Nucleic acid binder design. Structure first.
Ligand code: CL
Ligand code: CL
Ligand code: MG
Ligand code: MG
Ligand code: MG
Ligand code: MG
Ligand code: MG
Ligand code: MG
Ligand code: MG
Ligand code: MG
Ligand code: MG
Ligand code: NA
Ligand code: NA
Ligand code: NA
Ligand code: NA
Ligand code: NA
Ligand code: NA
Lengths: 186, 156, 154, 95, 140
RNA sequence: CCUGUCAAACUCCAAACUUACAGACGCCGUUUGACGCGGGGAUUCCGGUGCGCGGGGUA
RNA sequence: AGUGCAAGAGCAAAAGAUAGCUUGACAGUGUUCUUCCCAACGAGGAACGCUGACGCGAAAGCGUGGUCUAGCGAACCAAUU
RNA sequence: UUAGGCGGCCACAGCGGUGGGGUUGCCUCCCGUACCCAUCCCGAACACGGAAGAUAAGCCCACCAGCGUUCCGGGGAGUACUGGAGUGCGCGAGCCUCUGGGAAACCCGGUUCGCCGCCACC
């Protein structure tokens, strides 16, 4: 920018999107990566491999195409993340993928976080991933119990119209139950 | 000491003051002479052109310039002309003043490297070339043979 | 196709240059070889440029020289039309010569020595201290220029 | 030379042009090579590890097995046969 | 367009640059939340050679905690103009600084795809005076 | 802004050229066995000159 | 800028700074390069492995001392495990 | 790709600037702290929960060359330098001819305001 000698960072570093030092360590395993990504409203989960002209996604799942299986609840929560993980994990298995390492991009390794929920899901789908159980949420929170109890302190529906008034961690089970047998795109 | 000892450009460039100390001051008094307040807004422009690459000790520069400008006082102390010596003695010179043992000499002076065809001196005058004469005396005190060249001046 | 003739001896000439002449089948002064005009061959002749004489000869000249100084891969046998016919693909020297010039074959391919050991130039050559453009005898020549030399060394 | 360390006279070959300055792309540090492949040896100034003796910069050897993640490249120094331990970060596919 | 262009207060830093403290206490009550130590850099003649060393405290207030504070701070100040930032900030006073900016600032403070705020979307000294002056007082 | 100069221990640039590997031609090798491997016996480790490039030195 | 110290080189979501934790400055044994270009030569040095035991980390992973190139010593005898 | 995620090359992509875009869907800003989690002080950030509002940032789309960069034309320049050769010239420094290569600065005019891969998606 300033001169001939000026050093312009890599595009993905300018965009503040890729952490290249972590990327390298991640690529060390030689295994596919389980890209765990979030949005204000959604949660994405991809299984990326290395390629000649860039990464190759062999299997993915988005919290949106979750409804495609009977989801009638918000998609930017814990139960959502887990399921998207399990959904991507399954598609992953279908694709012949057996193991991967957790890439959480620029997110933070906070215990019980949605990225780890994503990881728990993918693992339960059958994917073999290097993990640590006590950094994961305690199942109930994954089910969405923390939100149901939060609506207990109601007075006003936590969900604007949406579905239910007291919410449903049960709707969570019905879905995980669904994903664990047959159905299309899995 | 003789010019013969330092007039050739056969040695490496030696100019890094960060690695050379005790370099003698230059004897060259000024580089801009005459009406330096004014810019080259003159009809005529003569130049003294060196005809061979050589090294010119600040010694010779000072003597050459003085003998030229000191003469350009055929026009007066505040005459209408401007005189310029464009070269500076960057090249540090040594002398081995033990015999050939540990002979890397000690800094004894400076010289300017001029390539054949460069102009060492440039004067600016109105149709009043006394300057042509100031240079017959100038190249008299520098090693090389020289060419007195006139540029803007088809007033022959 | 160019005709190569070594005009300067080996003494003092770079080794990598001598080896090149040798790769071109020339191992003595006045020895001549015929070389295709290819990139690979072009680089070689250029390197040897200062100790040789080269150029494209005329059909006639080549024929004169072939007849006068060509030899079998082994032996004395004179390479005349008959020899050419009874030993090569062609019917006579002219036929061979044409083929060489149009670079369709080579002296070896036809069982002939790659080298035309010429005679010293009758009347003397122009000097081995300067190139042609300077009145010498070194470097690339005119077809008319090469012919004179070759002919003088017939 | 005034000294005889490995980095003697390496100012050039081991420095980056101002613009290629800074951490290098991971893609080439992870590249995988097969035994028999020809690879050009060139240290990446930006990459500390996986290095070989500066003297071999410019060589083109033959991958013949690996040691850990590092590769074992056979080269011929002058007339001597040598095996060099080197990481992908410092190798490139010939052709 | 507006609504997302109209200024707002983002943090008010109240700090007492002492030279070696007991002062935290008053900051805690004047604001309403714990103060933070102020280590110093460089060794200097004011017998301040210690690198890591308590030499003051500060308190960054946000939201109501910031208003409820300025609702008494500002009144104790008169100044305005020239004493304003080129980014629409201003410090008066014990120091009390007010950082002002518009709605989409998190873009520059987040981790992922962060970005610098465009000069146009920045807050000018003028656009600042207006907002505040338009909140219980007068400019210059 | 205008204007005057430099670098063996400067470089936004940058040759010729030297060099790793590969293919092609050439030349060479398969009764003259190359390339290479193993062994026996040395001499040698005062050098000199021209040319190109040098570094030191008035030379 | 900083990174202990020459010079040259490397380094920015770090190789620098702060905080916290930790003792991998660990035991064993090698491969290779260097020392000594080519091309034989010891001590020393380095890079890269494996076996074992550990530290940290969600993990990939990182740690075979300090970012890299200086800071080193044979036989005989002693003392030590 | 009517806005996305992971990348490769790592400024042709930087710096600066203009215009345009969200009615249900996407990214955001945005709203909000019971929880997992968090600030040596602050739900600022990090984390979690969520849609009342917005397209003003960001982002995506279209475009501008003033600066920086890449490549090209013409000029500089077959100049500077240079591998090979010479009973060519010069007191010498050094130069010249033949042969094989061949630049930098700078000026003028174009180019460049990224390209490409995989996945997902009215
Ligand atoms: Cl993310
Ligand atoms: Cl090595
Ligand atoms: Mg015979
Ligand atoms: Mg006679
Ligand atoms: Mg003669
Ligand atoms: Mg050098
Ligand atoms: Mg060399
Ligand atoms: Mg290290
Ligand atoms: Mg003894
Ligand atoms: Mg002892
Ligand atoms: Mg807009
Ligand atoms: Na003495
Ligand atoms: Na003279
Ligand atoms: Na780099
Ligand atoms: Na050793
Ligand atoms: Na403290
Ligand atoms: Na917008």
């Amino acid at each position: 920018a300033t001169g001939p000698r000026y050093k312009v960072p890599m595009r993905r570093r300018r965009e503040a999107r890729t952490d290249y030092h972590q990327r390298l360590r991640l690529l060390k395993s030689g295994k596919p990566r389980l890209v765990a990504r979030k949005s204000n409203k959604h949660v994405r989960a991809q299984l990326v491999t290395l390629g000649p002209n860039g990464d190759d996604t062999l299997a993915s799942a988005h919290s949106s195409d979750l409804a495609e299986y009977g989801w009638e609840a918000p998609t930017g929560n814990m139960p959502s993340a887990y399921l998207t993980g399990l959904l991507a994990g399954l598609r992953a298995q279908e694709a012949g993928v057996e193991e991967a390492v957790l890439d959480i991009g620029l997110n933070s390794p906070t215990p019980g976080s949605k990225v780890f929920a994503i990881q728990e899901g993918a693992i339960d789908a059958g994917l073999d991933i290097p993990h640590n159980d006590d950094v994961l949420a305690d199942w109930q929170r994954t089910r969405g119990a923390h939100i149901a109890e939060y609506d207990e302190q109601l007075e006003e529906p936590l969900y604007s119209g949406d579905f239910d008034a007291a919410d449903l961690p049960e709707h969570f089970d019905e879905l995980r139950e669904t994903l664990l047998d047959g159905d299309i795109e899995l | 000491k003789p010019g013969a000892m330092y007039r050739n450009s056969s040695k490496p460039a030696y100019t890094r003051r960060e690695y050379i100390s005790g370099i003698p001051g230059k004897k060259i008094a000024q580089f801009d002479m005459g009406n330096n307040g004014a810019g080259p807004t003159y009809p005529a422009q003569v130049e003294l052109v060196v005809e061979k690459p050589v090294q010119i000790r600040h010694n010779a520069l000072e003597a050459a310039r003085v003998a030229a400008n000191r003469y350009v006082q055929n026009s007066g102390a505040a005459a209408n002309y401007k005189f310029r010596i464009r070269k500076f003695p960057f090249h540090v010179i040594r002398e081995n003043k033990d015999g050939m043992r540990a002979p890397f000499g000690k800094p004894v002076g400076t010289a300017a490297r001029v390539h054949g065809a460069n102009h060492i001196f440039i004067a600016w005058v109105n149709p009043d070339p006394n300057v042509e004469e100031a240079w017959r005396r100038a190249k008299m005190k520098v090693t090389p043979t020289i060419n007195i060249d006139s540029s803007p001046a088809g007033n022959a | 196709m160019h005709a190569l003739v070594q005009l300067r001896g080996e003494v003092n000439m770079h080794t990598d240059i001598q080896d090149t002449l040798e790769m071109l089948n020339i191992h003595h002064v006045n020895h001549c070889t015929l070389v295709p005009e290819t990139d690979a061959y072009r680089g070689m002749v250029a390197k040897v440029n200062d100790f040789v004489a080269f150029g494209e000869p005329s059909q006639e000249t080549l024929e004169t020289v072939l007849a006068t100084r060509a030899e079998p891969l082994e032996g004395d046998a004179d390479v005349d039309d008959e020899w050419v016919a009874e030993h090569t693909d062609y019917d006579d020297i002219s036929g061979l010569a044409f083929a060489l010039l149009s670079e369709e074959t080579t002296l070896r391919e036809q069982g002939l020595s790659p080298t035309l050991r010429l005679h010293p130039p009758r009347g003397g050559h122009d000097g081995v201290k300067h190139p042609v453009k300077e009145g010498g005898q070194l470097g690339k020549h005119d077809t008319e220029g090469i012919d004179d030399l070759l002919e003088a060394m017939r | 030379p005034s000294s005889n360390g490995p980095l003697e006279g390496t100012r050039g070959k081991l420095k980056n042009k101002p613009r290629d300055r800074g951490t290098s792309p991971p893609q080439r540090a992870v590249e995988e090579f097969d035994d028999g492949e020809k690879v050009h040896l060139k240290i990446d100034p930006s990459v500390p590890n996986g290095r070989f003796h500066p003297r071999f910069d410019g060589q083109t050897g033959t991958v013949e097995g690996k040691q850990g993640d590092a590769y074992k490249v056979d080269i011929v120094d002058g007339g001597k046969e040598k095996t060099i331990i080197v990481t992908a970060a410092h190798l490139r596919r010939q052709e | 367009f507006h609504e997302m262009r109209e200024p707002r207060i983002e943090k008010v830093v109240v700090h007492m640059g002492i030279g070696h403290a007991n002062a935290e206490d008053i900051l805690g009550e004047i604001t309403g939340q714990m103060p933070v130590r102020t280590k110093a850099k460089r060794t200097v003649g004011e017998f301040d050679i210690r690198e890591g060393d308590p030499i003051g405290a500060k308190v960054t207030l946000r939201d109501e905690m910031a208003e409820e504070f300025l609702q008494t701070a500002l009144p104790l100040a008169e100044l305005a103009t020239s004493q304003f930032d080129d980014t629409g900030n201003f410090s008066f006073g014990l120091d009390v600084t007010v950082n002002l900016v518009r709605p989409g600032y998190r873009v520059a403070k987040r981790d992922k795809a962060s970005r610098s705020i465009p000069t146009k979307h920045r807050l000018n000294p003028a656009d600042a005076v207006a907002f505040i002056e338009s909140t219980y007082d007068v400019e210059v």
